[PDB]
Design a protein around this nucleic acid. Sequence first.
RNA 1: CGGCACAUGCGAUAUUAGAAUGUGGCGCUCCGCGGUUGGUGAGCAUGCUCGGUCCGUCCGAGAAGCCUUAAAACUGCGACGACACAUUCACCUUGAACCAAGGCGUGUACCG
Lengths: 99, 79, 49, 1334, 105, 50, 49
Amino acid sequence: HARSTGSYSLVTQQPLGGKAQFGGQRFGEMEVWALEAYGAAYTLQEMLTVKSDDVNGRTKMYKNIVDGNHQMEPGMPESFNVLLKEIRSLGINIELEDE
Amino acid sequence: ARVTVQDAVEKIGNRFDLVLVAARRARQMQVGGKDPLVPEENDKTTVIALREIEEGLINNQILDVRERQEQQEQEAAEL
Amino acid sequence: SAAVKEFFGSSQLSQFMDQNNPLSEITHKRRISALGPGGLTRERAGFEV
Amino acid sequence: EFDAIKIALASPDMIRSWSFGEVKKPETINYRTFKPERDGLFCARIFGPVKDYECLCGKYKRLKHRGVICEKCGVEVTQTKVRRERMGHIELASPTAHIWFLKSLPSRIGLLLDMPLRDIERVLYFESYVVIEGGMTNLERQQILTEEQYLDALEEFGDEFDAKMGAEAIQALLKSMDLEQECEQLREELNETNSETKRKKLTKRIKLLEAFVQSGNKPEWMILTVLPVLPPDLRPLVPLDGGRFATSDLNDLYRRVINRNNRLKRLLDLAAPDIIVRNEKRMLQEAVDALLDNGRRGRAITGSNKRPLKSLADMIKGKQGRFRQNLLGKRVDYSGRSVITVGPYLRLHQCGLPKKMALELFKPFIYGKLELRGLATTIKAAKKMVEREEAVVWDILDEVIREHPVLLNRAPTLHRLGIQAFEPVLIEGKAIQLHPLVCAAYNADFDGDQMAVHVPLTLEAQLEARALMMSTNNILSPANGEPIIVPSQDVVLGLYYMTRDCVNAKGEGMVLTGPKEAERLYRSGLASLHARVKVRITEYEKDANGELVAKTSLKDTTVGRAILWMIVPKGLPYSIVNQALGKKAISKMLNTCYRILGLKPTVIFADQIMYTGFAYAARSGASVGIDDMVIPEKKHEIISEAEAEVAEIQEQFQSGLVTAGERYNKVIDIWAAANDRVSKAMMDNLQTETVINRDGQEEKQVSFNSIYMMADSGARGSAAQIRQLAGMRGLMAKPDGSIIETPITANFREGLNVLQYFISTHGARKGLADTALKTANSGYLTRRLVDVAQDLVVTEDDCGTHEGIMMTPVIEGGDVKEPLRDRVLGRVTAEDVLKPGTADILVPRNTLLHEQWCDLLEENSVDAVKVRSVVSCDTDFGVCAHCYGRDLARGHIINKGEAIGVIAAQSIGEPGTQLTSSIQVKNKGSIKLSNVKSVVNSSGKLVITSRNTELKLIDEFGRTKESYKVPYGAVLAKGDGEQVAGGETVANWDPHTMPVITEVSGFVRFTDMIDGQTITRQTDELTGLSSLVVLDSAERTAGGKDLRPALKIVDAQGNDVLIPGTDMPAQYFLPGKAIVQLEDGVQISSGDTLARIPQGLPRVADLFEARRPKEPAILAEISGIVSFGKETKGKRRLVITPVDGSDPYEEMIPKWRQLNVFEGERVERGDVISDGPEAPHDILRLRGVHAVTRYIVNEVQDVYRLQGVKINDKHIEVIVRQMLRKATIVNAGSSDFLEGEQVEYSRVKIANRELEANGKVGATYSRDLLGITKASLATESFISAASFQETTRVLTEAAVAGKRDELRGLKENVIVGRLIPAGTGYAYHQDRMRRRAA
Amino acid sequence: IQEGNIGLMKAVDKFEYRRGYKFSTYATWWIRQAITRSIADQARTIRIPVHMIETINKLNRISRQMLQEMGREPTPEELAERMLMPEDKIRKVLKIAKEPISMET
Amino acid sequence: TTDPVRMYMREMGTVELLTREGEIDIAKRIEDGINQVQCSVAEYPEAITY
Amino acid sequence: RSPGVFFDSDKGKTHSSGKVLYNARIIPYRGSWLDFEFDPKDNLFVRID
RNA sequence: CGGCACAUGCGAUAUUAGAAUGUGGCGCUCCGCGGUUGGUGAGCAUGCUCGGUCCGUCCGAGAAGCCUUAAAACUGCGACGACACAUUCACCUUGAACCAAGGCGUGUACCG
Ligand SMILES: [Mg+2]
Ligand SMILES: [Zn+2]
Ligand SMILES: [Zn+2]
């Protein structure tokens, strides 16, 4: 099978894996180490922000692609924002800083 | 076609600045601010950018000179 | 009925018959598992078993 | 958007600042209609609207308003994504201890109040009392009580006394404490008083205190007063299909907490008795502690289920937490997955890809091109056009594919060649066609394994996948310079059949004008494929400066070699195709073609090799059959002889002549001898069996057996498996690890009966279980190695230092295991190295050594080279490129930027699947002895008094062919410098007898040797020389227990013989079993014995972890004269006497164990005092950083080269660098740090170079090696210390410290989803770092 | 037991010894009332009211009795004539009484 | 062990049972208490007039 | 494991003294177990679980 | 040197016995009815007037009426829903339940 863009998981905005739930080949931890091992950095930035997690970034990417303008507006991943709300929903203050 | 990127590595070193330079050039050719300086063989803007690197007439320095020249022509075209 | 239906419906020892081959039926019925309740697990055991 | 991530504690004012509502009621949603209940855990006025821009009642449904709130029911009408974002709070009635600051092993409330944890839990569970600053009447501050003692203290002191119990008491303790007063107090206790281990704990506590005050925290924030709650769409309660819901278990946890908080408010309204409210406060403590981290209590399970529920720390920590399941690795769109297959018609820059996958992946590209070309008016028409698959879209898809690389990926992606790019060729089919030469990089066989494709969407990712990750770029491994696109199995068989020669064939010994009529002769059938033939070939060479000098000649070769010669490019000489061309030879062919002609002829040459290999393997018809395995006629004869010999040993055991063990060993030796005779029978019956004739009687040659070609070419298998097919198969081992005396005397060509096969099954199943378990452990080793070393990035172009280690060849006892050439090739020199004629500069000081420079090294006689190593670099926060080396997919020096820690750790952990007398000199040369101190005895020999002697067999070219660790007190035949012959045993020691040899010559005597107590009178039956011999510790009496027997020398005059050269006599102390052979007043010579003393992969994960060895080698701290102290404590005091320095060091040695040095000798620092393994801590702390990195690389290269797997040493060296980043400072000086504080070496280095550039004094440090699971968590960046290992301790240790994380090193940047400061993003981070704060 | 202790404190509030009963007979009803009201109040994710839970417990009791009378299990068509409800409400009472699945099941 | 139900049992296990007359005695103490608070009301005229 | 009585050794591994221990065990079919074991200094010990 | 206790790591990636009664008030119920302000997708493909015409149709600018306003909102009258309080009868009678036991490591605290 293959997936262009299908459904997304609820609690973390990621494409849920499976078949015929349209899945997505899980670009796991060792493959991220593999792209770090090359000089590939834009590939990894779109590989774990825009193609997967960012709720604005995937629709911005889809618009930019159907306009034929290959360009990504990265933003911030959504599951990292979930991690901030989970640590912040402990007694632990975690923030982002000034500039 | 472009099977190996070796000549572009010999013109622009460091193998990582090549990606950034070719990316900037192919954006100048895809978003229609420019048009190619080499005959295209129905290649995409990626391969046309790498071929413009291999002909030597594009690097970071020539792109900077051309971009400042476009900014000076904007300053002259303010009227 | 809850206990006996819970055992036949949900256990590590009660599973769907592999039924794509007469051999597969006749060797899934002849299977000697060491897992399940009252037996060792894959995480805990073990090499001599 | 932002910079460095900060983490700290949460004040209740901060928590009320976060929250947009108080959640007062435990409802979730209304049951009848599923609107959320006000104001429950799912609310509207607390969190947000349910639908996009719509109130809950319906008064505000559209975009007419966005700022308003409805006054019927509170809804701030916004997006519903806001409901994913806003948080709530719970006003806890009684306060509550936070479980993370209470139950983690370095407990923070525990060692913040300096109070044991069981008493703290005794206070928090309302079992006791604790005084809270209760004045000074009778009771101290931390003095706990009980209830009866509380009544005692209250009736004895009615007032000025304060002692609560529970969480209020701990909160009052933390609030009452003045920190800096106790800071002054502990500084005074660490100035005057010294209670060593306790003051080490004390300086740890003062480190915590002055780290806490330096932060912005207050201690009473460790007790929760207002508890924050998580947004609803993170704990969702959503409809499944069927009217039944899925709740997360956090809804259960917050429902329980809200429920018990409302119950406690209701009880304190009704003025409950004390037992009930103490019950309820314990219950609320349990509810909160189960919400924050369930599992550190009695594991409060959920409802209608026996399974334990899932709390917050269950969602952060672990394999399924957000750090490892949804941040470090994400499931990705624009991907596909299918079964892989071969398709040999490809160039290796392209792979097959199905039309249906290419239509499904590239859907938005097709949409864009169709609405550009106007075939679809809108985009819904484009959807229906690609849905119906009309004939116009396939030309569009062929336009969007043409130059767009996809990424192919196999699931065990161990090393970095697991993800490679290709250009797709569309396939009628449903299986990805994958180029064959690439597959050895993947470790992908085609037995059903399935691979995944990803699509670079953006333009920069297309250029990355073409410039960095295209398959034609990676033809060299990152582990070593060997080719990874080595031709694998069919192609090497096609070559080995093509380039060979039989003594008679068609066209034997004819003449050919070139390769072209060689092809015309073979393809017409006049001449055979292989017949020895003179041809005319024209080879080119690079004799001048990049110039192709042509020379032509008649080479005497075969036909098939001439046919392959058309495929060789211009540059290579003809001798690369004039041999048989197995697998090793074709790897050398591709290596020489790459090191001469660059990249492009090597890529197109590898494609042409693969094509011609498959084609002439098809023309070979190389086919295995049952007649292809010749059984020796000498098989059953040798088996019958061995069956008679085991009957001989059977009769010799039934005769009682032998015991069982020597019987067993003799039987296994004769079966191994029979197996070796069968192997040497079957090899000579296979390989030379073809005997044919040409112009004469006969002639033998190498065989055209099918299985011999398939074993000699190196295609599949070697002679072990050929042995198990033709001769007998081995000797199997039972589950004991014992090995059966009755081996399997049948191969697979013959049948195996039931018992032999049943014995073989055990070895097979043990093999399978070991492969599974070693796969798991190799994965864990790779993960620890990358997570200790992602922070290291090549950052500077050059540091310009003079440091370096000393590359020598690694010969040890036998022949060469890894020469000088392939060790130093690729590195860089520190200083210039010189010819054996001195002052002859052969290389200058720092040049990149490539293959012509190693040729210049080998044409001279160099043996040892100083080399810049990454473990001794000077650069801050990385390794400078000029110090690292060159080895990469390219051949040049490493570029500025590229991450080498990750490629290093992958190249180490990737072969983790594959892992498991006297001097008999072999070669001839001259003899050399290093660190030798010896004396000539009376017998013309030479006895050795120094045990650091290293024996080197130096030939006429200066290099070392053999080395021997010379034991102490050996008997040299020749001296030093004399030309020795092969086989000549020069030193012959007694390995069972420790020598008590001397330098003196005179009368041996007894001193402090009392008969019957220290020495017994033995009268020998065999020799007959009765003597007085030292006994053990049990039998020596209380007088002579501590008094030791000693031997000393006089001459004929009675005066004490002094050592010739010094003034000390040889008074030597004997242990138990040290046999006194020569008695009082008996003459000896120089060096005679005064007495005689008779008798895998977890290794790598022990080395890099650097665990303490079980029996450590003990080593002397400082160099000096060794001496003994007090006796019989179980230990002895080893005392060192340096000449210049201050002596008074003594070390406890368990004196049962055999030592090495005698008391009369002298040791150097770092010299061994006993034998056995040694800790890396000792080698680092005594010898030097170069010595410990040499120790690690030599030990782990022994472990890898035992299996025969090459790993370049740069990778192990940079893991050694990442081990020893931390270093404790000894002398503080002008710096800010402490006498026992552990800070990283780069941070103290930039502090000293600011101070040492000034006139002030610096801070001297002590370098400290840490293991990979401890040097990775002791990090100045806590997300890289929280992503893999123990999470709770790291977040609490960085939450009490207020620690600030500057994103520093690729783990955080993968976490936070921005560019990586190694690869293409290095220029971006360099531009930003130039922009940031400048 | 804490809801029972609240009920016990209410019993000690409203206890009258001059009726002559022991404390146990009077206090047991208050303790059971508080505990039953609490289980009906706060032991469910979706809070279903008191009379609704009384209806659910009647359904489980009658379907416990009929299962040993008929033998197979009762269909809700038998619960139409067995009880006083019009059998279309019994379907939704049977629907509401389902506890939600844990999302980590 | 923590097991706070067992800590509750041990915290209440020290309190012993009542005889059948001690309940009447505690009830008479309750009567004395409500008697004294109603007699405290009995002196205050403003509550009366309220 | 068959219900009955098993006399296992568990050699070596306790405290690295080189001494072997011995543990007897009564495994029921339904109920609580029973263990008997020695220590490194020759003292017998019971375990009900 | 032993014991007790605790913590922590790994254990592959990927693909798959309650019952009954009453009263009270409430409405973040979208359920019938009334009153109040208050609209829009209709005639109008020129209903009308004037101007251009490629035209008798389309463009450009005007005015009116009829008719679609309970829509949106507000407030009251019914139904329902939820909530509180009170009462009657019957039963019940003073310390529970619980799983799981077969691997390899690392470390900490306490006591002797
Ligand atoms: Mg396979
Ligand atoms: Zn509203
Ligand atoms: Zn350096």
